[PDB]
Design a protein around this ligand. Structure first.
Ligand SMILES: [Mn+2]
Ligand SMILES: [Mn+2]
Ligand SMILES: [Mn+2]
Ligand SMILES: [Mn+2]
Ligand SMILES: [Mn+2]
Ligand SMILES: [Mn+2]
Ligand SMILES: [Mn+2]
Ligand SMILES: [Mn+2]
Lengths: 237, 237, 237, 237
C-alpha cells in the first residue's frame, strides 16, 4: 500500500514490536520498527519543538527534538530518499491514541523544500508556515479524527470539550499541494520541517505519539492503525 | 460566475471595449474594461518581467512591467480586495490569442502571501517559486491549451512544433493549493507575485495578452473567452 | 546633522511640541513633530508588536501596532524616501526616558529589504531576524545605554538589577551592515520591519517611547535627546 | 594567523603541494592541502554555479559545482566547525592568479545562516543576496585587487580594460557584518551559500582558482598568497 518515511515521537514503549524501554524518537523507513532511535525525555504538558532536515547530497535524514530549558535529543539515519519515495509526495503530521492516551496538539508547522537545477539560477521552491489554524483550513487535507480551529490549533486526535484526550483515536493532516522532491536535472534537493507540539495526558503512561511523515500523494489512514501503529502503518512488520 | 481581479499585459488595442490605442498594462476588477491602464512599450521577442504587489493596510494593487535596458511601466489602483474577493482564492496566469496571435510563454513564476495576526509572532505564509516547469507538474492546475515541459517552460497558449503560435487559443495555469487572503484576526495581509514572460509573434499586430489573476478557488475558463477577453471574462461588460 | 525617518511609539503626550493628548503612533520625517499620528491604546506590561512597510512604487510608509486580544492602531503617510534619505542607510531601534520612565525592552526584531532590478531575475536582498540577543552581539552597534543579553533581550534604556527602569536614559541599536535602499536601475525597492516590545512602568505616566528609524550610516545619538526627543532629534523643531 | 575553512575551485594542478593532476574541487580546513578533493570538469568561458551547505547536526561540509547541460561534481567532508572556527566569523570569496592566469568574475552570491534555539520559535537568521554589484557596495569589504561595478559584476582579480586577466593578482570580498555560527543554547545551526562565476582565460592552462571561505572576522590577505595559495594561506603547509 502506501510508502511511508516518518520521524516518530513515540511516547509509549511497545518493546514487543522493537521499541526501546522508554519514550524515544526514531526514523521509520516503510515500517514501524524504526531503523534508528534515540531516548527522548518526554515532558507531559510542555510545548516541544521538532526540527527535521534532509538533503540529496549527504543522503541523511536527521531530527532534533527539544523543550525550553532542557537538553535536546537527536537521531540521524543514512538513507537515499530517491530510492524509497516517489518523485511527487505529500508531507503531513499523524498521531494516535490506543488504550493509553494523550492530546496530540500542533501549535505551529512550517516546511520548506528546494530543488536546485544545473541551469544557472534554476531554483524551484515551496514554503508554507502555519502559526495559527482556522476552522476551515482549505490548504490542509484532514483525515481521521484531526480537526483545526480549536484555540487556533491543530488537534490530531480526539479531545473532549472539557479538554480531555480520548483513547483509540487516529488523525492526520497533509499539506494540500503535492511536493516535488526529485527532478532529473536537480543538483541538490533538500527540505526542512519544524513543528511545535503539546502532548498532555492525565495518565502516567501516555500513548501513542506523533509523527512527521512523507508519503505517496494519495496516502490514507491504514485500517486498524490506531495505537502503536501511529496512523501510518497497517501492521507491525 | 467567477470573481476576477487581474493585472493584464494587453498587447492589442481593442478601442471598441475601452482599450487605449496602444499596448498597455491595466488593472481589471471584475471586468475586462480596466479600472486603470498605463502605456506599455511592448517588445516582440524580448523576455520581460512583471511584479505585482498589494497589502491590506494601504489597499492599493500596484504592478511594474520592465524589459532589460529599458524604462519600466507601472499602474496602481486603490482597491480593498477584502470587499471584492472571497477569503480563500487561487492565483494563476492566463493568456489568449484570437484572429491575431503570439506565443504566451512563461519562463518563471514566484508568489508569496503573508497573513500577520495580532498574536505575538503569528504569521501564516505561503511561497512558491518555479524557475523550471516539468512535463507533469502536479502542483499546477492547467486549463484550456496551457502545457508545461517544453524547454522547461510554461506555454499558456498553443504553439506548433516549428514553434509558431496559433490563433484562437486560450490557456490558464493555477497554483494547486488555495491561498488564504483574509482572516478575522489578521492585522496585515500582503502578497507579491513576479513572473518573466516571452511574447513573440511573426506578425506586426500581436494579440491578445497575458494576465496574472486572483479568483474564486473553482474558477474555470469562461466560454468564448479567447481573444480580447483573455481567458478571464465571459463578455465585455 | 543626521537625516532621520522614524516610526514613533510615543507613550507620553507632550502637547507643547505637538503630541496629541494621548499615547500615539506617528510618522516622523526629519522632525519630532510627527507628520501624521494615530491614537494608540498603550498597554503597560503587555508585549506588543509593531509592523512597518514601505515600497518605492506606492511611496507610502505605513505602520500597524497591536497587542494580543486587542484592536490594532495604524498610521500611514505618503512620502518618497528617495527624496529624504541617502542611497545607503542604517536601520535601528531607539528609546528614551526623561522625568517619567519605563522599560524599553525589545524581545525580537526582523528586517527585510529588497531591490528588484530591470535585469531579468536581478534581486538584491538583505534579511536579518533576531529572536534572541546575546551578551556580545557583534552584528549590532549599541549606542547610549542600550545593552543586550539580559534574559536574551535587548534593553534600549537603563534598567536596574531589581528590574526597575531608570529616568533620563537613552539608547539605540543599529544593524551593523549598511542597507541599500536605491539603485539607479531598480524598478521596485521595498522593506518590511517587525519588532516585539515590552513597555512596563511602575508609574501611571510612562514616558518616552520607542522608535524604529532609518538614518544616514554614521548617525549617532544627538546631545540632549533624552526624554521627549526619543534619542533621535537634537531639538523640537 | 587567520583560521580558514574554504571550499576551493582549483583550476591549476600543483601536484607538488598535493593537488591531483587535474582541475578539482576540494575542502580546505586550515591548509591549502585539501582534506578531500573531487575531479572537476572546468569549462573555460562558461558560467558555473557552486552550492555549499553545512549543518551542526550532521557535521558535514558538502559542495556541488555544475555547469548548464553538464554533469556536476561534488565533494563532502566530515568536520565539526564548532571545533575549528570561532563563534563569530565573516564569510567571503577569494581568488588569485600567478604565472598562469584567468578572470575570476562573480556574477551573483547568496548566503543564508540560521541558528535555531531550544526556546519555542527562537530562530536567529541572516540572509543576503547579490545579483548585481555596484561601484560603491558599502556592505562588502574588498581586499587586494577585488573591484565591483564592472558590468554589475564582482571582479576578484585584476582584469585590464580590453577585458584581459592579469597574472600575480589576488583579491577577496567579505560580507560586512559578522555572522554568528554558534550559540550555547542553539539546537541546530546551518548555512548555505551559492555563487555563480565566470572563469575565462586566453591560455590553455588557466590558474589559480576561486574559493568560498569562512574566517575569523579580522582576516586579511596573507603576504605572498598570490598564485597557488588562493589569497587564503601564507604557505603550503
Ligand atoms: Mn510505541
Ligand atoms: Mn517506536
Ligand atoms: Mn486588448
Ligand atoms: Mn486592455
Ligand atoms: Mn511624547
Ligand atoms: Mn509624538
Ligand atoms: Mn592549484
Ligand atoms: Mn587544490
Amino acid at each position: 500500500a502506501d510508502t511511508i518515511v516518518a520521524v516518530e515521537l513515540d511516547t509509549y514503549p511497545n518493546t514487543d514490536i522493537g521499541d526501546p524501554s522508554y519514550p524515544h524518537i526514531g526514523i521509520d523507513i516503510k515500517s514501524v520498527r524504526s531503523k534508528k532511535t534515540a531516548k527522548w525525555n518526554m515532558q507531559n504538558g510542555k510545548v516541544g519543538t521538532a526540527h527535521i532536515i534532509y538533503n540529496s547530497v549527504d543522503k541523511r535524514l536527521s531530527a532534533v527534538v527539544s523543550y525550553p530549558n532542557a537538553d535536546s535529543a537527536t537521531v540521524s539515519y543514512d538513507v537515499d530518499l530517491d530510492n524509497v519515495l516517489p518523485e511527487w509526495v505529500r508531507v503531513g503530521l499523524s498521531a494516535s491514541t490506543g488504550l493509553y492516551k494523550e492530546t496530540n496538539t500542533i501549535l505551529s508547522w512550517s516546511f520548506t523544500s528546494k530543488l536546485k537545477s544545473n541551469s544557472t539560477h534554476e531554483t524551484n521552491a515551496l514554503h508554507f508556515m502555519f502559526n495559527q489554524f482556522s476552522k476551515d483550513q482549505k490548504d490542509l487535507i484532514l483525515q481521521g479524527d484531526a480537526t483545526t480551529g480549536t484555540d487556533g490549533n491543530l488537534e490530531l486526535t480526539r479531545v473532549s470539550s472539557n479538554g480531555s484526550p480520548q483513547g483509540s483515536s487516529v488523525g492526520r493532516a497533509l499539506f494540500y499541494a503535492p511536493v516535488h522532491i526529485w527532478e532529473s536535472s536537480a543538483v541538490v534537493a533538500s527540505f526542512e520541517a519544524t513543528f511545535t507540539f503539546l502532548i498532555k495526558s492525565p495518565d502516567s503512561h501516555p500513548a501513542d505519539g506523533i509523527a512527521f511523515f512523507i508519503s505517496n500523494i494519495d496516502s490514507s489512514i491504514p485500517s486498524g492503525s490506531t495505537g502503536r501503529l501511529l496512523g501510518l502503518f497497517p501492521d507491525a512488520n
